[model samples]
Target: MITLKSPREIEMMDESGELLADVHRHLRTFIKPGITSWDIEVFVRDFIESHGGVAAQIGYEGYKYATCCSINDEICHGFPRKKVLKDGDLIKVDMCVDLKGAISDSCWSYVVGESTPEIDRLMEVTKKALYLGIEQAQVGNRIGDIGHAIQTYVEGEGYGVVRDFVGHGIGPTIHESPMIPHYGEAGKGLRLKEGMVITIEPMVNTGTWRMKMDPNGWTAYTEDGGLSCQYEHSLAITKEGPRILTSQGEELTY
Candidate 1:
């Protein structure tokens, strides 16, 4: 069912999102060259628990890790393992937090060391696309408006937006109604309404928008073996604008 949150419920979810954002803020400094992905898993588990929030991903459909650590070319759900990170590695960390039964989801991309031109452009464009999509999440706007904005911006930059994994309604549960694709015709799909909480996560690829799933049944890899990046945010549609719940300490209240 499509759920529209109340002001009180939205505020609770925002608090959950704020907790998740704080984790990402610390990860910006904690994730560096030579650290294992497993280290990230431990840190997130500890940090979230210590802060009175639960890492919601753990045991979700048998998923074991607290975070999805996707490196370059690994689109999403890459297991947080013991592999050592190196310089120039682009990593996307995705996770959700459940605070007092309210849920918030977010994903952020980071470079382990000095970034290259390709990686920098990919990250920049991907993040910009996310905001562009967020901008369209307004009351009375069609869902297609969001995807149309994102797909147009991403493809214009010569990047491909993944079609397999789309965004979705979040809160009350991890996955809710209204599957949000990253590519669609403008003014199409269901019209958005106030108090609806959803995620706008565009997975951009350096190659075709195709992907291959790992045998382990979770990780997604770029079909052409090219780099991929993602930036995601959970937001609530309000009369003022889109209030970003998972902001990483930014002034993104639109």
Candidate 2:
């Protein structure tokens, strides 16, 4: 069900998003070479709980991790494991938090050690795409406008936008209605409405957009084993405009 959040509910979600956003802020310095992905998982669990928030993804759909640490070619849902991170490695940490019943979801990409020109550009493009999508999340716009803004910008830069896993409404539960794709024709799809809370997460690849599933049936990989990147933010549509709940204290004007 697409439950439109009341102002009070949106406030609750904003609280949850604040905590989730703090996690990413701490991770900026904590995620370095030699750290295992499992270390990240543990850190997230501790951080969220210590800050009076619940890690919403721990038991969702039988998934047993506080975060999905997708590395390199891994697209999403890559299990946080013991593998050691190396210099130039890219990692995407996706998670959700419940702050006293309100829910907020976000995914952020990080680079381990020093970054190269290629990885730098990929991350820059992907992050920009996310905000470009968010800019279209106004009340009275179509869902496709969000995707169209992202896809056109990404594809224009020669990057591939993954289509298998798109964003969705995020409130009252981990996943909700009005699936938000990252690639589509502008001015199409469901029209945006006030009180509608949704996430605009775009996964960009350095190669083909096609994905291959691993034996675990959970992790997804790029079909050509190329690098992938993603950036996400949850927001609400209001008369003023889209209010970003998961902002990491960064200016989003673009």
Candidate 3:
């Protein structure tokens, strides 16, 4: 069942969301060539604790990682390692924070330096798809409306949307009910209502949508080794429209 947040609960979550956004902002400055993904993990853990937020991904059901530092072809859940990020490499960082049982998750794809035009285009299209998906998160819209919006926009740009992983309702639990797929028919699925919170994440690939898990049994990568990008945000349905909790005070266009 989908749990709607009360006004007070939403206010508390907004605090967590604001801190999560600040974590991403700090990551932008720390992400550079020669920094190991493990190093980045340490920085994130320390930062979160110092800011009075808990890194929710750590020690959850034996999943031992503070953050998912997926680089290059890795789609998501790539475990942080000693591998150093180099120039021209693409990295996808996924993070979650918990504050008094409320959780907020977000992800972003970043290029360390100049990359191929194809890779750059993939990032641009994927982020655009995420924003377009967010636009469909109104009170009267169906869950599939958000997915269809993302699928239509990304597919039109000739990109492939990942089928394995989809966004979900997020709150006290990291993964909640109502799976939000990236490819679905509009006017279907559960009807969104005010106070319902969900995540709209778009994972777009430069080639085929098929993916394979690495030997680690966690890191998912593009099957054809083509570039992939992802963007995510947590949003709440409101009487006026959809309010993006993850962005906090940032002027988000979508």
Candidate 4:
């Protein structure tokens, strides 16, 4: 069932969400070349704990890291590793922060150094797909509305939309009701109601939308071996509109 989040619970979650977003800003500097992705895992674990927030992914479903490091063709669920990054490397950093049982997740992609126009455009388009999907999260809209909005926008730009891993409802369980896909017909699926919390994460690819999970059963990669990018935010549906709980108070940066 899609449980509605009380206004007070939403307020409580915002407390943790703000801190989670700040963690991104404060640690983004470490993403520069010469640093290993594992460096980020350590930093994120320390940062989350010091703020009284739990790194939700750790120990959840056997995921041992605090952040997912999806570089280049990797789609999602990419774990931090010993690999050292260099100039021109593209990496997507994804993490979840849970405070007092409320969870919020977000993903941001970065380039180790100067990025080319193609890479820059991919990030821009992916981020745009996320926001467009968020716009459909309103009291009267259906879940498909969000997915359709995202799918149309991204596919129209000639990008492929990953269908396997969809956005979902969030609360104590992290993954809750209402599996929100990134592609579907707008008028179909569950109707939204005030207080229903869900995430609109559009994982778009530069090639075929198909993907496969490795033997690890966690790391996902693009089937066509093309670059993949994602952007996400967990929010609540309201009569007025969407209230971005994981808001960063600033726009996404390259």
Which candidate order results from sorting by TM-score in descending order? 2, 1, 4, 3
Cα lDDT of model 4 overall? Answer: 0.86
Give lDDT: candidate 4, residue 245: 85
Error of 2 at 38 (Å): 0.5
Which run of 10 residues does model 3 get worst, by summed lDDT?
245-254
lDDT of 3 by residue, 140-161 (tens): 8898888899899888998789
What TM-score goes with each of the models? 0.98, 0.98, 0.95, 0.96
Encode model 4's per-residue lDDT on 1-254: one tens digit a residue: 67888999888778878878888787668778889888988998899999888999898888899899999899999889998988877788888899877788877778788787778888899998998898889888888998899999999999999999999998876778889999999889889999988888888899899998989989999998989998888888888899988887765542
lDDT of 3 at 9: 80
Instruction: Please give the RMSD of candidate 4 to the true structure.
Output: 1.3
Q: TM-score for candidate 3, please give it.
A: 0.95
Best of the two (2, 3) by TM-score: 2
Better of 2 and 4 by TM-score: 2
Segments in model 3 whose C-alpha atoms lie over 4 Å from true places = 248-254
RMSD (CA, Å), each prediction: 1.5, 1.3, 1.6, 1.3
Question: Per-residue CA lDDT of candidate 2, range 1-254, in tens?
Answer: 88898999999999999999999999999999999999999999999999898999888889999999999999999999999999999999999999899999999999999998999999999999998999999999999999899999999999999999999998888889989999999989799999999999999999999999999889999999989999999999999999999998965431
